[PDB]
Structure formats: structure tokens, C-alpha cells
UniProtKB/Swiss-Prot annotation, chain A:
Pathway: Amine and polyamine degradation; ethanolamine degradation. The gene is eutC. NCBIfam families: PRK05465.1. PANTHER family: ETHANOLAMINE AMMONIA-LYASE LIGHT CHAIN, ETHANOLAMINE AMMONIA-LYASE SMALL SUBUNIT. It comes from Escherichia coli (strain K12). It is found in: Bacterial microcompartment. Catalyzes the deamination of various vicinal amino-alcohols to oxo compounds. Ethanolamine ammonia-lyase (EAL) allows bacteria to utilize ethanolamine as the sole source of nitrogen and carbon in the presence of external vitamin B12. It is spontaneously inactivated by its substrate and reactivated by EutA. Directly targeted to the BMC. May play a role in bacterial microcompartment (BMC) assembly or maintenance. Belongs to the EutC family. GO terms for biological process: amino acid metabolic process; ethanolamine catabolic process. This is Ethanolamine ammonia-lyase small subunit. It is an enzyme of class 4 (lyase). Its EC number is 4.3.1.7. Adenosylcob(III)alamin binds at residues 164, 185, 215. GO terms for molecular function: cobalamin binding; ethanolamine ammonia-lyase activity.
Curated annotation (Swiss-Prot), chains B, C, D:
This is Ethanolamine ammonia-lyase large subunit. Keywords: Bacterial microcompartment, Cobalamin, Cobalt, Lyase. It catalyses: ethanolamine = acetaldehyde + NH4(+). It comes from Escherichia coli (strain K12). Coiled coil: none annotated. The gene is eutB. Catalyzes the deamination of various vicinal amino-alcohols to oxo compounds. Allows this organism to utilize ethanolamine as the sole source of nitrogen and carbon in the presence of external vitamin B12. It is spontaneously inactivated by its substrate and reactivated by EutA.
Amino acid sequence: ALDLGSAEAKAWIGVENPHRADVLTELRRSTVARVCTGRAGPRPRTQALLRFLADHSRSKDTVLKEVPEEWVKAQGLLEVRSEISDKNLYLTRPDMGRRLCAEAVEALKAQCVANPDVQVVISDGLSTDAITVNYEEILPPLMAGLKQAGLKVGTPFFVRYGRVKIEDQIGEILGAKVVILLVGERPGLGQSESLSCYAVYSPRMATTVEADRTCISNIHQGGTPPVEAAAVIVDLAKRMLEQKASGINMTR
Amino acid sequence: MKLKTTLFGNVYQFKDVKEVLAKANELRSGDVLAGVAAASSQERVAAKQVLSEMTVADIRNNPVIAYEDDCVTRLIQDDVNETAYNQIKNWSISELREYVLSDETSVDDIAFTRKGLTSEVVAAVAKICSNADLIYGAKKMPVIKKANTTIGIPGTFSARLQPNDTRDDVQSIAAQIYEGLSFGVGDAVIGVNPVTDDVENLSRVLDTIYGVIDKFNIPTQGCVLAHVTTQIEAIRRGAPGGLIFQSICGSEKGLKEFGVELAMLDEARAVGAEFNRIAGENCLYFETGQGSALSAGANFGADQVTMEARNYGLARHYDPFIVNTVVGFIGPEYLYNDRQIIRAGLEDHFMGKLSGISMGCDCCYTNHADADQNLNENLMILLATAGCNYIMGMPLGDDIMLNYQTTAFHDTATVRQLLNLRPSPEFERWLESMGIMANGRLTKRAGDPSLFF
Amino acid sequence: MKLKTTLFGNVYQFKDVKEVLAKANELRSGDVLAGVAAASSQERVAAKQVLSEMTVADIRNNPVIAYEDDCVTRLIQDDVNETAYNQIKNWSISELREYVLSDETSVDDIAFTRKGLTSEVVAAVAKICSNADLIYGAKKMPVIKKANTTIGIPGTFSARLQPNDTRDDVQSIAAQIYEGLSFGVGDAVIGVNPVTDDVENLSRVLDTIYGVIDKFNIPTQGCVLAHVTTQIEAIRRGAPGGLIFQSICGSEKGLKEFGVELAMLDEARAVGAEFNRIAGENCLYFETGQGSALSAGANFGADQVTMEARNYGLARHYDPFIVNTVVGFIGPEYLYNDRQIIRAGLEDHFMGKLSGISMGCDCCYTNHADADQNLNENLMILLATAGCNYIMGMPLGDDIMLNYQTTAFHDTATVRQLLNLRPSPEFERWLESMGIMANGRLTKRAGDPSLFF
Amino acid sequence: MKLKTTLFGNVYQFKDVKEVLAKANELRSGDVLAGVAAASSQERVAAKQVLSEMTVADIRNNPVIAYEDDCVTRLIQDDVNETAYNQIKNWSISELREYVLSDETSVDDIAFTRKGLTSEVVAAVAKICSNADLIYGAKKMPVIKKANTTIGIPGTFSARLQPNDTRDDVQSIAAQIYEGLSFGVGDAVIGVNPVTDDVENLSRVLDTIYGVIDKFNIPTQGCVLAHVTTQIEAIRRGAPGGLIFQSICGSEKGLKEFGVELAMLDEARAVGAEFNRIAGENCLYFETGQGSALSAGANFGADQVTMEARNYGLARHYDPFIVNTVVGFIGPEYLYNDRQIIRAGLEDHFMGKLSGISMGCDCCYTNHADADQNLNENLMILLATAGCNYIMGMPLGDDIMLNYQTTAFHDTATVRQLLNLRPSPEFERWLESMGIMANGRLTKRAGDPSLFF
Ligand code: B12
């Protein structure tokens, strides 16, 4: 009796007659990659295939799941959205996910502080878990960072159905010097809570290219811890303001 | 030229070459998203016929982005052998398809003929090929290159070891390397996408890859797939240089999105020549994939197949050791499902081989696309029959850090043993001496990374 | 007997073996239609695991239709080698899968092991196999038979010439035969589906097929795919007997629907032995396909994959020369799209080979299904790599009276030359002497039916 | 850095690396003429030992002409793989010699190692090699290139057809072409040295060569060996471009003497890429030979072997299809007799192959040298065993306008049949189809130019 989602299933060594089985356990411990599952001929072992299939079924669900409107409100966050109306359209229309809807633009000028030095934006993007699991761990220290020995912090808000390029429009509208997006990257097979930060100096819809952005990826408890990542993003923001540059245009 | 045909009594009119090229494509979500797709199957076939009736000259003289406007167009046009072009310029695309497919057309015939093509013409041929056409045509167009291994020899099949980690942890990277090598993966390259784009980290990751390479005297090459500028800096500072990598895009605007100047790729070759631990003459590594130009808003009304072909035209200029499309790396917005991902993989590979580059494929999909692992296994085998130079290998295909599913180490061994294909001969010798492979087949003791300990 | 598992903390319970077998299947429209499919991906995976942990004895002892109520179940069960069964009865389906796929398992190992199986067990193995598993598993299970040609030898690839006509017009039939032969199609059989099921017409069609066979001394065999009884009657009255055909279903109820009795297949065997122009020992030809039982109301709550496997248990009893699934012959209600049709084709072929029959596939689709010719070309190549014994051949694949698209004559020559496979050795010799083939490849003069005139 | 040794109790001191390089040479008339030769056999051996104990770094850091003063030195030095150099820089020339000759050193080992060398180091190795060393060393360093033929594959042996005429008479040129082809000569190139260096005449000669090539669909390439600039001009104005030729010298001063700029070889490469009828990637052709620098006053106190090696460092930069020394083209003042001409031929070829160029040899002598045809036959066979890529062919070896004796068409057929070597594979296929060759041997009907009429 084995639950394919259990720690025991995840730790299963499948190699048949191991040359050195203690090495195998040490190898299995050293990575989250699905090593040491062995084979049947050149094909995967059955248990390995079954767990792969189980993880995929759960992975598919994480792409479709949406954070309650109530949760966004409970974090004290302004919720705005892109031109996208639902999850299905989000997946097929990136061009609409890169643009605020008409009411979103007006809400930003109404409710957010004008001309900030550093603007923090949060969006579900392609993974809701990346936002929900990590939020309380990254957001407070980040805000407290940009304030403590810091400067004119913008007011944080949630964008539903957002794509990275939307931060350019957000930058122009609010007149922000630095725009920080915390967004869900596409779900992995066995992980869904991987968060990335896309940050850009003084963006412009008409001229800003992707290389102008600095990316911090793989933020989570299995990568770079949200707390530790927050201090990185603060220091990144300071550097952007000092150099008046982001992405490939930064030094070192 | 004609931009018009009559089909079942009804006239089908097109505005320009660009439109014909686009609407001739098999249906995909990216073409619909770009707004350039056919309205129906009828209009698609009409486009195919119009295209088939256009000459090489018609398509050559009408690149989707104009010469004076685009440095990729310029690079592609300027690389044309005008003598080879003059021979074929009045051929119809229908005739070019049949020429490529003919059993009386040799590898050497195509070697000269392809030099008279441009990427748009290469795309045009692909667009009027069936799936079997793409497979058979590609197979009779081998492209062979040499680093520390030889890749692309008919009867061989290579694989990139992709030992990625969420923190670039060297023990995790090493563990995956040992696992991959035990399945006979890594003759293409041992190549890591790093988390941090930084000289200390790049060196450390390279140090780890080459620690294994040097310990066991492995005929292969290492690579770290950070931006080309940081690889160059790392190598200049004394890090081991194997292959130098850059993702590319088929327009000037697309390259700007990626932060790439052509001068950087010139520099990459010069740095390789000065520093890199490579026996053969090829040392560059490019990756490509349909949808990238569209994402960058840099397709200029052109379909994603034509744009991908232009990647290969650009890549050909730098005579790389390896190129692969990353076929379903992005999402369903560009390729929605199994059918579309398979078709694109076959197209991409065929076009690469027609362009004369060392073309492989990352047979892959994402978890928000309408796809699963059986798709990867379908496509990997089809492309293998097509003479695909290489695929990826990860443990069970699960990328713990790039968040998608590629092919397993298992799958390379499966392909090889199914189709009686061998690794790169240099790598094969090493596998044999390690006791991992005998007569192309995994030994009993293979598939066990503890063998190295 | 466990009929339950916990997946992600959620308890999944199933009622019986049959429901486990049904829900373990990859998603297809037929299963949903039958009301037997999983309600979610998680339940499918839970069903797969539960099935994986069930033993050979669990599945063997619980056929989807009872022994006393069903003559096909009886035929299957009464054909079991009980010594072979006793060796494996306590193996899990998981272990059996790994056993079949192991490179340490020889063809001769599987030769004995398979005799201990029933069709339900064969189905169970296929249900927990990936696409590459199905392909590699099938490839290492060759099945070889002999009529006037030998089929199934690894490294070879055969094709049925299917020269069908709307009016059984002998000039149309002959035209397509000469066309098929010129591409090297016809080593499996020259087999016509007649529009009229009567003795005079059957004899006239056979006369036409054998007119060609005899004039050119072709090593092959003819067949007219009417009901068994009309074939027998025609042959007793002096018409040339080649292969004797019957479509089959995996239940007694389904056989009734078709109007066939097991006694008829007994008589066909004996009529073959007295009358038929066959050098080798095999002369029967069955066709099958997922959905037929469900259509007949004869699936008894069982999924179409398990029922299809039961066809092979039936067929194996009669040691036919050839069997092929007609994979997408019916419509989207049983197999909806590319993905499902490929999966079915791989399943059908694997299950056929595991059952020890000479298994081929009519790679095909209908015009009301979500499919096209590129699907046929995908599947034919994948199956060829799996060692599929034969596919169909028609001019461009267009059947003018059965109203569907199968594979072109072109497709067999493409497959052979792509994968370096040869025809049946006897037929290949004939092709070489006709100047149609050299070293496995179509000569310049091939592909031209006027060569015979 | 030791510049001294004790031999038989006698102290031998040399002034610098250059004098060590010069005096280590086997005796030849050119060195005595240059005033750089040893004064005795003992001093020669002392020079050899001193050289043997010098490191790669010692020689690399002391080129015979300074970096800032000489563009050839710069080209050579700037082409060094510094990672490869760093691995070997502390090796003695003795160790490098043993390394090159070792059976444990593979072709791929030498592939990387050679990138760490400069031409002076290449020369140093050759100076302490015996004749058998030079031959066996060269043989295990194959260099393979591709135009319309592949040259340099071990087990093959190519030949330039050299159909020269006193008046560039197109009927005389054609006669010698048909004669050469009938012996299987012409797989390296069909290359004419014209008497008049103008565009109209160049184009007419090319027309004649390509007239023959085109009528018989010959896999080869043509060349007219005028100055680079006239070749380019002719080709830009529409003359058929095959190989583009230039004679080279190992110093800037020497290039000036010849009237060549490096920029011209750059342009030749680009003109080849735009215009030339070449399937493969190599299209340049250089000729070299000991003595040219010394003649030009451009040896700067360096011996003719070291200067010759510098030619190969120059040539390697441009990755030519073919290079050959013209071993005894000039006169007895540089190479006096049989012995010296053989030694030079072996040196030149070894150094060429070590430098990684497609090295052949015009085995030849002049009538004012102490030599005869038996010398040509000695050297051609020795070099063939060394894996010399190609030699010349003329009717009986008599050049009627260059006034010297090279090898006969007979000599290539003799070499091939003696040593069981084949032509370039593409050319061999053509010869087989012409009925001129079977299994590597001249057929009865071969050797008869009227066969083409
Ligand atoms: C998908 C993807 C891509 C796609 C992006 C196209 C698209 N998605 O429409 C393609 C395949 C086109 C791509 C290309 C490259 N990528 Co990328 N990419 C990813 C990936 C796997 C997913 C990102 C994601 O999920 N974003 C979330 C969604 C919601 O955002 P989105 O709006 O839908 O997509 C945007 C971003 O993905 C952005 N983007 C994608 N990659 C990169 C890289 C950089 C440096 C930047 C600034 C932006 C960017 O492009 C889209 C803008 O419209 C990540 C890995 C990961 N686990 O996150 C790597 C990753 C972000 N990419 C990486 C790199 C280096 C590259 C390249 C520079 C490769 C190279 N060596 O040259 C190029 C150039 C990127 C550019 N400047 O445009 C690195 C970033 C390293 C860093 N810390 O700076 C990552 C982290 C992978 C890795 N190496 O570990 N990539």
C-alpha cells in the first residue's frame, strides 16, 4: 500500500542490482530530480511511471486554479485585472494579458500613490500557488525593506490574469521609477509554487524590450527562500535607482 | 507571379507573399493568435497551391521583413550563393519540394542547391509537405558537425544531458550527470541552464560539469546556457569553454528583445577559437522555437513557421555544432496540443536540415498546454526516424527548474535500441569502455549512476 | 484482491476488476460513451495503480464476460497453458509490464510466458504502458507467419493491396492492383472488399486478382472479404482460394451481431487445407477494431480496449496468417481525434503481438472524425518502428467505396526506405526480378503501373 | 632556455632559437646558400639536441620574424588556441615528437593539440624527425576537406589534372584533360597555369575546363592559377568559379614580392561564397615550396624549412580545400639532388598535416637540378604511404610551358593500384559510371582519351 504523493514514493530507489546502493541514497537525497528510479529495459519502471502520471494530474489542476477574490481582499490588496476575463482566455491570449482593461487603468490612478520610486505589483500569472504560498513570506519584508533606509514606496496591488509586459503600462500610468512584478511562472510537474520577480527601470510600452528587465526566478522553499529573496529584490531596486538602468544595461 | 487561385469554382485571392506563406500553414494556435491563419481548410489548400506555383525568385525577392529594415534579412540574403540561386530561381516551390523528396536527388545535389535558398524559400517548401514528406525529406538531408564528438552521421542519434537545478546545487547537477551518462546521454553536450546569470556561478557550474568530464575522460563538451555575454566573460576569466550558447530570433527586433547583437555571435566564435576545449571546428549552440518572434512583437505580420525558418538562416551563418528547436517550450498560445506540437517539430527539423544546420529537437510540452508525456514519446520517435541529430535528456524528463517536461534518459536508450542507432562514435567508445554499452545496447549494469562510484 | 488505493490523501475505491480495467484506460470518446471512463485524471492514475498491483490470477479469474455465458471467454480460457499460467499467476501486472519490457527477457521467454495469459491480462498490461512502452514492447515481440509470403520477420514490412471498387468493376480493381504492385504493395495479401456478397461476383473478383498473380508469377495471395460462408461456397465451387477472411468481435453477442459462428472458422480452416493455393501453413485473415463490441451492445459494461484484446485471444486460437485492427474505421464516437487514434493503434498492435498473433494495422480515419492524412502518416511510421507486420495500401489512401482514408501505396515504400525495411523475402525477390526494387528501394521505373503492360 | 650542449666533450653554443632551427635541418643547398646551415654533422646533431630540449613555449615565443613587423607572424600567433597552448607550453620538442608518433595518440588528440602550436613549433618537430618518422607521423594525421569531391580520407588518393599549354590553346588543354580523366586524374582539381594573366583569357580557359566538366557531369572543380585578383575579376564577370588559387610566402616581405595582400584572400573567400560552383565548404587552393622566401630576400636569416612551415600557418587561417608544396619547382640552389628533394617533400607534407591543412605535394624536379623521373617516382610512392592528399598529373609528367617534370597520369593509377587506394569517393563513382574504373582499378578501356568521343 503506497500513496504516490507520499514522501516514501518520492524517495523510492528503483535501481535493480546496484553497484553501490549507499551512493544511490546519497544521490537521491541530493536532488529533487527523479534520479535512481532504475529501468525495465530502456523504459521507466512501473512505479516511476505511475508517480509521474499522478504528479501530472495534480500539475494540470494547478494551472487552472484561481485565488479567491476574498483572499486578495484579506491581504489588504487592491485587485485589478488585465483585458482577460477568465482563465481559459488567459492561456490563449497573451496579448490581452499584457494590457490593463479600461477600468483597471482608472483604478490605478485613483487608488495608487503617484510617481513612486519603487512600485510593487503582484499577479497570479500562470501559477496561483506561487502567489498564495509565498505571499506572507516575501511581501512584508520587501515592503519593510524598501521603506527602512529607503524611499518613496508605491502601494502594492494584485493584477489578475497578468503577463510580464503589463508592468510597462503600469510603469507609465503611475510614473514609477522602478516597477517590480511578482508573478507565477508556469507550473512544473511536481511543483507549482515557483515565484519569479521581473523588475524594470522606468519602463515605456513603446521602447522597453525584454532584455531591459532583470529577472529573479525560482523563488520558493525549494529554491531561493521568499524571505532571502526579498532582501535581494530590495538591493536590486536600490541598484536600479543608483544606475538608472535595469536588465542587460546594469553593471557587474 | 500569381496571388490567386480558383478552387471548386470559387476564387481565392491573397494580398502578398507574406499572406500566402502564413495561410498555407497547417492550423496552429499561434497563427490564429497572430491573426494570419487561414479562415478554413479550403483557404489553407488554396494558399498551398498558390504558394506551390510561386517561384524560388518570388519568395526570395519578398522576405517577410525588408532588407534595409532588418539585419537578419541582410545576413540571410547576403549569404546566398547567387550562382546556385540563378540555377533554381525559376523553379516553382512545387518543383523544389519534389526535388528535395526525389530518390535521384543526392545529399551532394542538395548541398549546392540549399545555398541558393533563403529561409523564406525553405519555409515555403515545408508548408506544402505532409508529415511523412517532412520526415523522409529531412532524413535524406543529413548534416554532420564535430566538436569533441561527431553528431548527425546517419545511423547515429545523440542527446544533450540537461542537469538543471533550482539552486544550481553542484551535488544535484552532478547526480543528474551521473544518471544521464549511465543511460548513454550526453554525446551532444552536457548543458545547464543556470539560475543566476553570474561569472562566479557560471564557473562553478562549468567546474562541476568538467570535473566529471575530466575524471572519466569523457568525449563530450560542457555548456552553461546563460546569456552569451556572461559565458564569454566567464570563459575569458578562465572558466572551461565547451559550447557557447545563445537563444536566437529571426528578426532584428527579436534579437533586441533577447539583448543580442550579431557582433556578440562573431565574438562568440572568436572566443571559442582562443579558449575553448574543442577538438573539431564547431563550437556554437543555438536554440530556437516557434512563437518567439510573435511573443516579441517582432514577426511583422509573418507566421511563426516562416520566422522559425529565419532563425535557421541566421544560425547557418555561424556554422554551429548544434541547433535545436524547443518545440513546445512556451505554451498553448503558440502550439495548443499534441497534433500541433508534433507538426511543428517535424517542420522545424525539416527546415533546419534544409538550411544545412545540425538540427535537433527538444521534444517537450508545458503543463498548461493540451499535452502529456505520450506526446514527447510519439514525437521523439518520429523525429528519430527523420534523422533528428539529438534530443534532450533529464531524469524521467522532469525539469525541476524550467518547469516543463522534456524527454527522459530512458527515451534516448529506447530510440537507439528501437531503431538500431548508435551514439556519437567517440562517445560510444567511451560508453563501451565504461561497460555501459555493448553493441548499441545498454548492458545490465547500465542505468545505474552508482557505477561511477 | 485490493480494489482501492489512496492518491494524494484521497481514497479511490472501485467496484470490480472490470471497472478498474475500464478507468485505467487513457481518455477516449468510446469509454465516455460507454459510461465506463474515469471521472478525472487522478481517478485514472488511481485505477492504473490498483490495476498495477493486481495479479495475473486476479485478472485471469475475472474475465469481463462469464465463462458459462460466453463462448469467446471459453475459447480464451480453454487455450491457456496452465503450467505457464501457474508460473506467473502471482505476478502483479506491474511486474508483467517490467518483464515484457526488460532487455533480459528474450523472444523465447515471452513465447512461453504469453501462453499463460488471457486477453484481459494482455489488456491490463497495455493499460499501464506509455506510448513508447507499447512501441518498444511490441517490437521485441515479433510474430512470424507464412502463406505464400513470410510476414513478420524483424527488418521486414508488408502491405495489403486493397483494390476496392464502387461496382466491383474488374477493370478498376485491376488498375489499382497494377498500381499497388508498382510500389511494392501486396506481400500481405491482395484483398478486395466486395460491394455484393454473392458467389458469382466473388468468383469473378478472385479470377481478376488471380489473373494478375498467375500472369506474373507473383508470390502472394488473394482474398475477397465477403462473409466467411460466401468465401467458402465460392472456393468449394472452384474459385481460387487464397486467404479466408472474417471480421470478429470479442463476445458471443458480438459474433451473433456479425452473423458468425465459431464453427464457420473451423470450416474455413478445413476448406483452406483442402482447396487453398497456399504454400505455408497459415491461411486465415481477421480484422478487428475498438468500438465494435460497444456498437453491437455486446461489451457488457467493458471498455473497448479490453474487448479488442479479446478479439486477439479469439483470433490466436485459429493461428491466422494476418490480423489487423482497423484502427479508426468507424467514427469519432469511439476514437475522436489524432491522439486517441494513435494511442489505440499502438495499444491494438501491442496487444496483438503480446497475444502471439501476426498483428498489423489499418492506419486510417473517417471524414467525420477529428483527423486527417497527416495522422495516418504519423501512426504508420510509429507502428512501423514497433514492428507492425503490415498496413494497407490504396491509391493515395482514398477508398472509393468504403468511404474512408487509409495509407497510400507511397506510404509503404516511404516506410521501407526510411527505416531500411524490406518486403516479405519471397515478394522482394519477385520485385527485384520485375525491376521494381533494388536493395529495398524503388527503382527509377517503379511507381508506374504501365510497367506491367 | 638552454642554447648550448656538450657533444663528445665539445661545447656547442648557438646564438638564438633561429640559429638552432636553421642548423638542426638535414643538409640542403638552400641552407648553405642562406649561410644558416651547420658547419659539420656534429654541430647539426648538437643543434638537434638543443632544439629537442627546448620547450613549445621557447619556440612559440621566439618566431623567426617579429609580431609587430610581420602580418604573417601576427596571423599565426593570433590563431593560437591559448588553452591548448597552455597544456603543452612546457613540453619539450622531444616530448612533442614522441607525442605525435605515439600510437596512443589519436587523431582527435592531435586535433586539439595542434591548435596550441605555431608554425615554428611545427618546424621544430619536423627537424628532429627521421624520414620514417615524417611518413608515419603524417599518416596518422589525416586532414579531410570537401569541394565537389572529398579529399584526404584515409584509403584514398587524389590528383590534380594540370593541363598546361604554351599558348593557352584550348584544344591542347582539352586534349590533356581527356587524357588525365581516362587515367582517373582530376579529383583534386582541373587546374591550368595560364601564360597570359587577363580576364578574357581566364574566362576562355575556364569555359574549356567547365565545358568538359558539364558535358560528362564530372564531380570535380576547375581552376585557373593566375593572380588572385584576375580570378576574382573573371568570376565576378560571370566565368565559372571553382577553386580560387594563390601562391603564398611565409613573410610579409615575401607576400609583397608576390604582390598579394591578406585582404585579397579574404575577398577570395567571400567571392567563392557568392559565386562558386562548390557543394562543400572549402574552395581555396594554395601552392608553396621551400626556397621562395630566401629568393625574395624575405627569410630574415631563417632557414627554408621554418619559412615553409609558416606558409601552412598562413594557409590554415583560410581553411583551403587543398594545399601543395611544389617541392623541387625552382632549382638546385635550394634543393640540390634526389636525397634533398625527397627529404623536403616528406618535411613539407608532415608539417602541412601537423598544421591541419589538406596537404598534398607536387613531386617534381627541374632539368638543371641533380635529379630525374625516377626521383619523382620514389617520392610520390613514399608520400602516398604518408597519406599525401594529392599529387599532380600531366602526360608523362612533361609540362610544356612551366619547363619541369612532375608526375605522370600513369603515376596516380600506379599508386592507387599498388597501395589499394581509391579516388575521392564522388569522383570514383563517376569513373565507375564512365567504365574507366572498377574496384579501384583501371579497366581495359581506360587510359584512352578517345573514350570520351
Ligand atoms: C518560458 C520562458 C522563456 C520563453 C519566453 C517567451 C514566452 N514565455 O512568451 C523563451 C523561450 C522565449 C525564453 C527565452 C529566453 N529566456 Co527564458 N524562461 C522561460 C521560463 C521557462 C518561464 C518564464 C515564466 O514562466 N514566466 C511567467 C509568465 C507568466 O510570464 P509571461 O508574461 O507569460 O512570459 C514573459 C517572461 O517569460 C519573459 N521571459 C522569459 N525568459 C526570460 C528571461 C529574461 C532574462 C527576461 C528579462 C524575461 C524573460 O518573456 C515573456 C515576456 O512577454 C523561465 C524559467 C522559469 N522557471 O521561470 C525562463 C528564464 C526566465 N529564461 C531565462 C533566459 C536566460 C532566457 C534567455 C536570455 C536565454 C538565453 N540564454 O539567451 C532568452 C531571452 C529572454 C528574453 N530576453 O526575451 C532565465 C532567466 C535568467 C535570469 N535570472 O535572468 C530563466 C529563469 C531560465 C533559466 N535559465 O534558469 N524564455
